[PDB]
């Protein structure tokens, strides 16, 4: 009531039209709540027993009297009256508004008020009455079982009062309804006032829109705007028996097996014939073409070149070269160029090596590093050679052995030269002992390493000379001691069509990359030889590859190192790693194409030779596809040949064995001993061929991505797609078009027999597959319907974050006929610019239902990272494909745990389950039943097959899905959506293929047009596009194809089960992405095959002619039929990439791994170095660091990831000159260290990989901020003020940009705006709105920073804004040559930074920042900003760093076992929040004013009707915890990252049993740091589960102690009480199964408890080992060495003193002579032993504690006293140690040996033990302890917890739910409810003094009287029932003082005013009985004794003063109102007085 008044008063003050919407909605929510509360309070005070708060339905039933077990059994039941899916579990917890109990009748009243009562009525009834009726029926059934004395009945009432209170009377008549109506009218008037007077005019529309959904729910949706009615498909009559008969016809003849048998004689023979085909399909060569670019030669340690040393070198070089005699035109040109260079003026020489700013142009020098050579300066032959250059197929005889021998000799010599040594944070510890020592320290001295560094210098010079202004001029650089001398030529500029850079590479002959058969010549100076290489041309893509050849080779070698360590379990030997590095480098600097194809095909060749049956011949043919030209290709081919033959020969064995798969022994057929797989490069041998496949994959990934995109491959794929289209027309001409499209029929197939071909499907087969899939989909119709209806068919199309992505997407056809290649985000803008509205997905299909689908080949140079695939399509095609794929993914996700696998992180259960069934089936036998009981034994054998059937194929008629989808059982009540999908498939059937511009130019620019190409131009009639039917052009029809394949496989299963009923053949499969795993089960005779060879013969004789294919090798005739049936659906099992296995363990292991490692981490690692964003420094370092953190996600070990990060940082610090000693080093200009500088200004960086794996990408800046603020607050060091000034300068330099951010991209701190290559042109529509308009619009409609707009008006603006975003524009043109070259340019001395609106060099920015910091001064605003940032914004990221600095790693010396590769998800933190709708919606709701903003926010949000509430809640925290205000946009921007859930779908490839928790995966990474040893992360070995276990243990011991101290039956109690997952019995079971988590004071009792319940003594004896122990363990990488020279030790010790399970880590920092003793031991004797051991260890090396005398230390310390030792803050003056850190997190359990002589005491609440008979007695544990933070109010009861006590029976079961339990335990006051108490009094209990009061009433009133017929840390409840009885009263509050006159007056008045004889006392309300007893407690004691006289005196007063009941105080606690009201509610007045 008063709530309305105070809201009124607080709202009146606000002036009209001044409140924003959000507060208005808040106020009206409050007013509605208060108005509802008025009626709720009325009902509660009038009728309900409830008077304080609502109670759950289960609670009310418990109060009723029904035992708990009934409810518990009822819990599992699901309501059948509610088809939606409501569960009774959720039904219990809901709280009806009001409840009342009368006998077995329960009356629930739900109170609501609404304008339209009928709605409230019907909705509330539908919600509750159905479940209530179900419960009524179930409890009636239970009563009929003899469980309940009488039935229970539910009387559900609803009181729906009109908003105006018109129907108050009829709904609920009362004596005060008028005031209720008054209040309702006033509150409604207040609603009107606030809604019409207290809002801004601009925001009124938004407010009304909000109410339309919150309080109105009036506007009714017009269905799904209706869905058009397209024609459907009528099912045809197809019976499986027809297909079975056809198979019986087709399985009666010989059938060739598709695949071949893997035999060494066969694999070797395929090569010998493919060679004899290759050498004769091509002409013959005899001059191996050059393969090496840049032929260096190093014979000395290489010093990196510098501008100075370069001068001296180049001088010495030309000193050498000039006096040589040229003999070839190239040598002549070199001689002339050297002559010109040496003879240059000193001014020219000065300007040559000068920066671009100090450059002074000269006659002979025009640009730095270049000079001009003119015709007069040159020579005749050199001039002719220049003219020939500017004015500008055969294969090696691979068959011949001579060529192979020569090439092998050459390449092996080169590789032996690169192997020739030259003649000169936690992770660091491991990286120095494991990766460094064995990889870097072994490669650092190789000729490859130094040559690798040399080629960097030769590539940097070329890159610099490739500039537009430098190209046309010559140049002459030199290198190491004038040995290698680069002679660049006047190359072409960047331009297009190849920026061919031409150069010559004269060098000194020696070991290294020298190939003296392709050199232009070999000049001899007598003492040495100089090799003048031929002029070599290189383009950008093949120049970047060489430029980072060393880094790529080193990362490849590191990955190979990792794989070898995982495989062999030990580090490689130096020779192997050296050879591997040499091979990787040689491949890296030979980025050709043929090798990139050989290695690509080898990945699939390897599994095709390590399997019984597979098709190798096709793959081996693929090897001989392109001509073999260079010696390197022939060498690689020879090495392959040898390796493949050796691998194949291993199959001559396959001895059967047993291993144990999953959980079954299981037989095998594996080549275990004599099958070890060789290695491709070195002389090592791998245990598992998985390592070989990984090595070959690493070789393949070394080749540039650019290469796959080459014009030849574009022509190849164009012809591939045209060829299949041409054949489709051949079929459409041979047969009717309808036959090809709709599909032929069975009666035609079994009359032609040739229609069983690809691109021709069978209608009957399709229908039968659909029916077979329905057989399994018919059991989950409801789930399928829900999934289909939940795909959001009624949401705006372009608003989805997949239609406004960056993926490639064809656009509009230009005038010339060629089709554009725009991006999807552009297309959304283009359609939205001419739409006027945003159409739903279905609606857009209706509009674009006539535009023929168009598609084209993606543009390589416009290719995008997000673009996966190779074809692009226009908007109508994408819409249709989205419809189809959404429908089929909704349908196909309901069999995702049986046949297909989508998610669950990355689930294998579909395949894992299939194997388990097959494995169980195989472990058995079959008895084929002949006549009589005589059986034939048969041994069941499996035969696996792994084929990729689901993959898109170039020829695959898509019409089949038309018929298929018609029959598929979707479960929808109607066929509108099914028909929509059918029609969609009918519009993606005919497509227009548009031929590319590049191919158009190429084919036109060629003299010869072969017939192989003539047809390709006939397909296109207009020379620009043709018609392709069937093939859907690599569209995203993934799940649809998978479902179709699964349906056809099930069809084959059913077909086979009918063909051979007698046999027990088993077939089971499972799909995953593009690959499946078919498990064919087949039978073989156990005998010599005589009985079966007769049974089959007699079967064939009988007439079952389909038994000729089941005569031998059944699995062959199983796979034949399966393939044929799959081919009936146009699915053709690939004859190349298939693998049949006899159930090897290696086969299953590799297949399962292939389903978890989606992308090898090499690809990612090698991708980091190349293709940097180019967005500057902080965005190049950040991008590279981020792509090297995604490689750590895909299995890459932390050490290799750290190496990759180090290389990427070294590279990124060389483009911008940020490394020490370079130009832009911050320390040169700034006044702070190089590691204490903000990253954007050129700091160092985090540089770790764990800090970058969990924390983030820019944690260096956050740590800088935290340190600076903490120091500048606690101190005032000017250095930290300088740092803060630098950060403020960065901010000031960041806010001068334009407006762009959004949530998830908030870039706090600052960022120097590095110049970005602006594209020549601008993307269409990117400039639709002026940048000024965008800035203001963004600053105005802040909401759209968080929620994608949904209206066309506010969506075009958002899309165009997204276009104008640097990270997007740069992403679009990543492959653009201009951007690539700009990236490769050394941005060192160029003006690239932006300062004050001008382009300046990074040095200028550094100087300006330094000046700003010098002049910087602190202020309130920026200090507050920094404090808020560090404390709140970057708060979820400091947590990770603090986590990673508290974990002590320790190397338990062993070898780590390698397990499977599961893929968990790195959910930052799994939680169940109290705020729903997601922070984006909640915040966007706040900053929303326009009506459109309401429309966008409400639709996007998930529970709109609660959005407001969320905000309120979100406020309470931000002020309660942080203390900040939210009402500002800037503070919200600051705090948004702290709340916004990351929502990052991060998948990590962990190995073994690793939970999905983020801490778990981080712990696993910390356990994977060492490749060969086993780390044991110390803290807790893992720290919701832990704290829940802690609370459960606390309650368990608490109840144990209480019950044993009160003698109650704890035994049954522990079966009864329940706690959020199980009962205390199950809690103890879990404790014993896992282990009592370590705890300080509860272990001591947790063991006493367990030993007395379960009988196990594990915990009790375990605690007794903490008594004392030893076993000091060590680390393995920080062991201290012994020295007899000093008689001491030396080194960094890390011993761990294990006192049972109490660890004590001791570390000794040798350099600082310090130590950090971190322990967990907390007792005097144990800790004395700890000091004994640690002091011994410390003295041994020679050291002593940091002793010191402190009277009392402020913090926690280990002060010494005479009594002994003790942690904590002391006061007593005594000596103290230092460095003593008590971290209880180190406590970790471990199996311990030895027993104690232990005896228990006092019912087992104490325990006293001894080590043995020798040791003295010691008190081990006792229960006299006090526990804190114990959760009593979560205890629940499952059974009747009976509490017989003091010979008194109590029923505590409802008290459990009441929550008063604790009070009862602690004898604390409380107020019992009325129904709960009445149930506690279920057993009769009456007040004794009532008898004496009745006697007094009889004495004074003989007639009217009562009718009593029918009758520290120990708490013990000494109080009898009086305790709970007094819970309503207040005990002695009545007191023993009494006034007899008052008591007599009250007694007479009550007797004369009430008829106490109306009903017997036993038939009243127990609670009111207690109330009246308390009112009359101890009343007659002071009256009866002298009554005979006292009454007389009372009478006198009645006749003397006329006393009244209001003037009488009974003793001291007169309560007239309560007494009268309760008596009236329990006693009617006198009948005579009623009339008056």
Key words describing this protein structure:
RNA-directed RNA polymerase L; 2036 residues; nucleotide binding; seven-stranded antiparallel β-sheet; alpha+beta; manganese; Restriction Endonuclease; 78 helices; 8 domains
Describe this structure in words.
Its main location: host cell. It is found in: Host cytoplasm, Host perinuclear region. It comes from Hantaan virus (strain 76-118). The protein contains 78 helices and 50 strands. It is globular. The chain has 2036 residues and is an alpha+beta fold. It folds into eight domains: 2-216, Restriction Endonuclease; 292-424 and 457-547, no CATH class; 716-1154, no CATH class; 1212-1444, no CATH class; 1451-1561, no CATH class; 1579-1669 and 1793-1822, no CATH class; 1681-1786, no CATH class; 1843-2035, no CATH class. The strands form 18 sheets. Strands 4, 14, 19, 20, 23, 26 and 27 form a seven-stranded antiparallel β-sheet that branches. A four-stranded antiparallel β-sheet has the order 7-8-9-13, sandwiched between helices.
């Amino acid at each position: 009531m008063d709530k309305y008044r105070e809201i009124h008063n607080k709202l009146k003050e606000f002036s009209p039209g001044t409140l924003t919407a959000v507060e208005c909605i808040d106020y009206l929510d409050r007013l509605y709540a208060v108005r509802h509360d008025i009626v709720d309070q009325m009902i509660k005070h009038d009728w309900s027993d409830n008077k304080d708060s609502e109670e759950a339905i289960g609670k009310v039933l418990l109060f009723a009297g029904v035992p708990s077990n009934i409810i518990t059994a009822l819990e599992k039941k699901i309501i059948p009256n509610h088809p939606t899916g409501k569960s009774l579990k959720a039904f219990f917890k809901m709280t009806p508004a009001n409840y009342k109990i009368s006998g077995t009748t329960i009356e629930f009243v739900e109170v609501t008020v609404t304008a339209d009562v009928d709605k409230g009525i019907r909705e509330k009834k539908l919600k509750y009455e159905a479940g209530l009726t179900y419960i009524e029926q179930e409890l009636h059934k239970f009563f009929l079982k003899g469980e309940i004395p009488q039935p229970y009945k539910i009387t559900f009432n609803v009181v729906a009062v009109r908003t105006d209170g018109s129907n108050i009377t009829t709904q609920w008549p009362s004596r005060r309804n008028d005031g209720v109506v008054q209040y309702m009218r006033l509150v409604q008037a207040e609603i009107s006032y606030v809604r019409e007077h207290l809002i801004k005019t601009e925001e009124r529309a938004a407010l009304e829109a909000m109410f339309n959904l919150k309080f109105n729910i009036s506007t009714h949706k017009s269905q799904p705007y209706y869905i058009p009615d397209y024609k459907g498909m009528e099912p045809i009559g197809a019976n499986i028996e027809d297909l079975v008969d056809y198979s019986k016809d087709w399985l009666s003849r010989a059938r060739n097996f598709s695949f071949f048998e893997v035999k060494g004689t066969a694999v070797f023979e395929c090569f010998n014939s493919n060679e004899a085909n290759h050498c004769q399909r091509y002409p013959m060569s005899r001059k191996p073409r050059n393969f090496l670019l840049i032929q260096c030669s190093l014979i000395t340690s290489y010093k990196p070149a510098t501008t100075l040393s370069d001068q001296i070198d180049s001088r010495r070089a030309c000193s050498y070269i000039l006096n040589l005699i040229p003999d070839t035109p190239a040598s002549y040109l070199i001689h002339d160029m050297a002559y010109r260079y040496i003879n240059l003026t000193r001014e020219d020489m000065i300007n040559y090596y000068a920066p671009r700013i100090q450059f002074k142009q000269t006659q002979n020098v025009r640009e730095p590093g270049t000079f001009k050579l003119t015709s007069s300066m040159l020579r005749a032959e050199s001039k002719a050679m220049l003219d020939l250059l500017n004015n500008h197929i055969e294969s090696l005889n691979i068959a011949s052995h001579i060529v192979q021998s020569e090439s092998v000799s050459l390449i092996t010599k080169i590789l032996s030269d690169l192997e020739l040594n030259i003649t000169e944070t936690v992770l660091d510890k491991f990286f120095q002992n494991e990766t460094q020592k064995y990889l870097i320290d072994v490669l650092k001295k190789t000729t490859a390493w130094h040559i690798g560094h040399l080629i960097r210098d030769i590539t940097e010079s070329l890159i610099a000379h490739s500039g537009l202004k430098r190209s046309k001029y010559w140049s002459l650089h030199s290198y190491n001691n004038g040995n290698v001398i680069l002679f660049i030529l006047p190359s072409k500029s960047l331009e297009v069509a190849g920026s061919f850079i031409r150069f010559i590479t004269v060098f000194r002959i020696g070991p290294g990359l020298v190939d003296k058969d392709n050199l232009d010549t070999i000049l001899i100076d007598g003492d040495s030889q100089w090799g003048v290489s031929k002029v070599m041309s290189i383009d950008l893509n093949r120049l970047l590859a060489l430029n980072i050849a060393f880094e790529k080779a080193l990362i490849a070698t590191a990955t190979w190192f990792q794989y070898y360590t995982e495989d062999q379990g030990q580090f490689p030997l130096q020779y192997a790693i050296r050879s591997v590095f040499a091979n990787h480098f040689l491949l890296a600097i030979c980025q050709k194409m043929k090798l990139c194809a050989i290695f690509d095909n080898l990945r699939y060749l390897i599994p095709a030779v390590t399997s019984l049956y597979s098709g190798f011949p096709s793959l081996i043919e693929k090897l001989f596809e392109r001509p073999f030209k260079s010696s390197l290709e022939v060498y690689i081919y020879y090495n392959i040949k040898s390796l493949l033959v050796a691998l194949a020969q291993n199959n001559k064995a396959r001895f059967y064995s047993k291993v144990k798969l999953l959980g079954l022994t299981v037989d095998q057929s594996t080549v275990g001993a004599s099958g070890v797989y060789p290695s491709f490069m070195s002389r090592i041998v791998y245990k598992h061929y998985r390592s070989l496949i990984s090595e070959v994959t690493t070789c393949f990934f070394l080749f540039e991505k650019g290469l796959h995109g080459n014009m030849n491959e574009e022509a190849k794929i164009h012809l591939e797609t045209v060829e299949w289209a041409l054949k489709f027309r051949e079929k459409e001409e041979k047969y009717g078009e309808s036959l090809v499209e709709n599909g032929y029929m069975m009666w035609e197939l079994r009359a032609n027999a040739e229609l069983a071909e690809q691109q021709l499907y069978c209608q009957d087969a399709i229908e039968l597959a659909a029916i077979e899939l329905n057989k399994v989909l018919a059991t989950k119709s409801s789930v399928v319907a829900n999934s289909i209806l939940s795909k959001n068919w009624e949401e705006p199309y372009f608003s989805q974050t997949r239609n406004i992505s960056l993926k490639g997407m064809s656009g509009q056809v230009q005038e010339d006929g060629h089709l554009s290649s725009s991006v999807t985000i552009i297309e959304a803008i283009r359609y939205l610019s001419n739409s006027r509205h945003n159409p739903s997905l279905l609606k857009l299909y209706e509009e674009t239902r006539e535009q023929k689908a168009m598609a084209r080949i993606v543009r390589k140079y416009q290719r995008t990272e997000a673009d996966r695939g190779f074809f692009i399509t226009t908007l109508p095609t994408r819409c249709r494909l989205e419809i189809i794929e959404d429908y089929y993914d909704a349908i196909a996700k309901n069999i995702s745990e049986e046949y297909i696998s989508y998610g669950g992180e990355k689930k294998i259960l579909a395949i894992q389950g299939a194997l388990e069934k097959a494995l169980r089936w195989a472990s058995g036998e079959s008895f084929i039943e002949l006549s009589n009981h005589k059986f034939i034994r048969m041994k069941r054998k499996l035969m696996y097959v792994s084929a990729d059937a689901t993959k898109w194929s170039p020829g695959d008629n898509s019409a089949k899905f038309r018929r298929f989808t018609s029959m598929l059982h979707n479960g929808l009540p109607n066929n509108k959506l099914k028909n929509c999908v059918i029609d969609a498939l009918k519009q993606v059937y005919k497509t227009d293929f548009f031929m590319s511009r590049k191919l158009r130019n190429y084919i036109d620019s060629m003299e010869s047009l072969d017939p192989h190409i003539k047809q390709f131009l006939d397909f296109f009639p207009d020379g620009h596009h043709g018609e392709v039917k069937g093939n859907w052009l690599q569209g995203n029809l993934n799940k649809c194809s998978s479902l179709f394949g699964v349906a056809m496989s099930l069809l084959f299963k059913q077909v086979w089960t009918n063909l051979f009923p007698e046999l027990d053949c088993f077939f089971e499969f499972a799909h995953h992405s593009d690959d499946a795993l078919f498990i064919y089960g087949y039978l073989e005779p156990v005998d010599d095959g005589t009985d079966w060879f007769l049974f089959v013969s007699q079967q064939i004789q009988a007439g079952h002619l389909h038994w000729f294919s089941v005569n031998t090798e059944m699995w062959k005739s199983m796979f034949n039929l399966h393939e044929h049936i799959l081919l009936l659906g146009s699915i053709k099992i690939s004859p190349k990439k298939t693998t049949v296995s006899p159930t090897n363990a290696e086969f299953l292991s590799t297949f399962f791994e292939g389903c978890a490692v989606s992308i090898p981490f090499v690809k990612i690692l090698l991708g980091s170095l190349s293709d940097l964003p180019g967005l500057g420094y902080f965005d190049d370092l950040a991008a590279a660091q981020s792509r090297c953190v995604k490689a750590l996600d895909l299995g890459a070990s932390p050490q290799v990831a750290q190496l990759a990060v180090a290389l990427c940082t070294s590279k990124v610090e060389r483009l911008y000159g940020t490394a020490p000693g370079m130009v832009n080093h911050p320390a040169a200009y700034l006044q702070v260290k190089h590691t204490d500088t903000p990253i954007p200004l050129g700091g160092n960086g985090a540089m770790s990989i764990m800090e970058l794996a969990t924390a983030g990408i820019g944690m260096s800046d956050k740590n800088l901020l935290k340190r600076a603020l903490l120091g500048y607050s606690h101190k005032r060091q000017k250095s930290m003020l300088y740092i803060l000034g630098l950060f403020k300068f960065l901010m000031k330099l960041s806010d001068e940009t334009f407006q762009h951010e959004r949530l998830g991209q908030f870039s706090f701190i600052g960022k120097v705006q590095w110049k970005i290559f602006t594209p020549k042109s601008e993307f269409e529509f990117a400039d639709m709105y002026t940048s000024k308009f965008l800035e203001l619009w963004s600053s105005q409609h802040v909401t759209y920073d968080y929620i994608i707009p949904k209206g066309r008006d506010n969506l075009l603006i958002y899309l165009v804004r997204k276009l104008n975003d640097p990270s997007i524009v740069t992403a679009m043109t990543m492959q653009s040559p201009l951007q690539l070259r700009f990236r490769m340019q050394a941005k060192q001395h160029m003006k690239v930074c932006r300062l004050d609106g001008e382009w300046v060099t990074f040095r200028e920015v550094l100087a300006a920042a330094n000046s700003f910091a010098e002049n910087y001064s602190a202020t309130s605003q920026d200090m507050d900003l920094f404090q808020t940032l560090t404390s709140c914004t970057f708060s979820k990221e400091y947590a990770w760093k603090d986590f990673l600095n508290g974990i002590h790693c320790d190397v338990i010396p062993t070898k780590q076992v390698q397990r499977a590769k599961v893929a968990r998800t790195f959910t930052v933190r799994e939680k169940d929040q109290i705020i729903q709708n997601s922070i984006p919606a909640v915040i966007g709701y706040k900053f929303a004013v326009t009506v459109e903003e309401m429309s966008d926010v409400l639709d996007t949000a998930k529970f709109p009707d609660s959005l407001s509430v969320d905000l309120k809640t979100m406020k309470d925290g931000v002020y309660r915890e942080l203390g900040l205000d939210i009402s500002l946009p800037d503070v919200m921007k600051r705090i948004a990252p702290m709340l916004y859930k990351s929502s990052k779908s991060r998948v990590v490839i962990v190995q073994g049993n690793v939970e999905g928790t983020a801490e778990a995966i981080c712990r696993y990474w910390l356990k994977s740091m060492s490749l060969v040893k086993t780390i044991r992360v110390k803290p807790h070995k893992e720290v919701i589960g832990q704290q829940k276990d802690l609370a459960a243990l606390k309650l368990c011991i608490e109840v144990w102690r209480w019950c044993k101290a009160n003698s109650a039956p704890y035994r049954d109690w522990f079966q009864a009480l329940w706690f959020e997952d199980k009962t205390f019995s199950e809690w103890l079971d879990r404790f014993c199964r896992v282990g009592v988590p370590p705890i300080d004071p509860e272990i001591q009792c947790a063991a006493l408890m367990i030993a007395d319940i379960k009988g196990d003594y594990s915990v009790l004896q375990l605690q007794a080992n903490r008594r004392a122990y030893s076993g000091k363990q060590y680390d393995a990488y920080c062991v201290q060495t012994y020295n007899e020279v000093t008689k001491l030790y030396e080194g960094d010790l890390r011993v761990t003193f294990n006192f049972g399970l109490d660890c004590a880590r001791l570390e000794i920092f040798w350099d600082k002579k310090a130590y950090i003793l971190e322990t967990s031991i907390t007792q005097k004797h144990v800790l004395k032993i700890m000091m004994d051991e640690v002091s011994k260890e410390l003295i041994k090396c020679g050291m002593r504690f940091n002793t010191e005398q402190v009277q009392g230390v402020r913090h926690m310390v280990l002060f010494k006293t005479e009594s002994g030792f003790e942690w904590g803050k002391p006061n007593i003056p005594c000596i103290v140690y230092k460095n003593c850190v008590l971290r209880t997190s180190l406590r970790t359990t471990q199996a311990i040996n030895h027993k104690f002589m232990i005896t228990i005491k006092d019912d087992g609440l104490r325990a006293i033990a001894q080590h043995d008979e020798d040791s003295p007695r010691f008190l081990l544990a006792h229960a006299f302890h006090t526990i804190r933070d114990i959760r009593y109010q979560a205890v629940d009861a499952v059974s009747n917890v009976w509490f017989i006590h003091k010979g008194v029976k109590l029923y505590l079961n409802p008290i459990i739910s009441s929550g008063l339990l604790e009070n009862f335990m602690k004898n604390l006051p409380a107020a019992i409810p009325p129904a709960a108490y009445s149930l506690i009094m279920n057993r009769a209990k009456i007040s004794v003094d009532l008898f004496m009061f009745n006697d007094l009433l009889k004495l004074i009133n003989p007639r009217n009287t009562l009718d009593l017929s029918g009758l520290r840390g120990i708490v013990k409840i000494l109080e009898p029932v009086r305790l709970i009885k007094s819970w309503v009263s207040r005990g002695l509050s009545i007191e023993k003082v009494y006034s007899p006159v008052n008591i007599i007056l009250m007694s007479r008045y009550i007797s004369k005013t009430f008829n106490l004889s109306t009903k017997q006392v036993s038939l009243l309300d127990p609670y009111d009985l207690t109330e009246l007893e308390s009112i009359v407690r101890g009343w007659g004691e002071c009256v009866i004794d002298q009554f005979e006289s006292l009454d007389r005196e009372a009478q006198n007063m009645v006749v003397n003063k006329g006393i009244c009941p209001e003037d009488v105080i009974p003793d001291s606690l007169f309560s007239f109102r309560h007494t009268m009201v309760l008596l009236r509610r329990l006693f009617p007045q006198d009948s005579i007085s009623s009339f008056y």
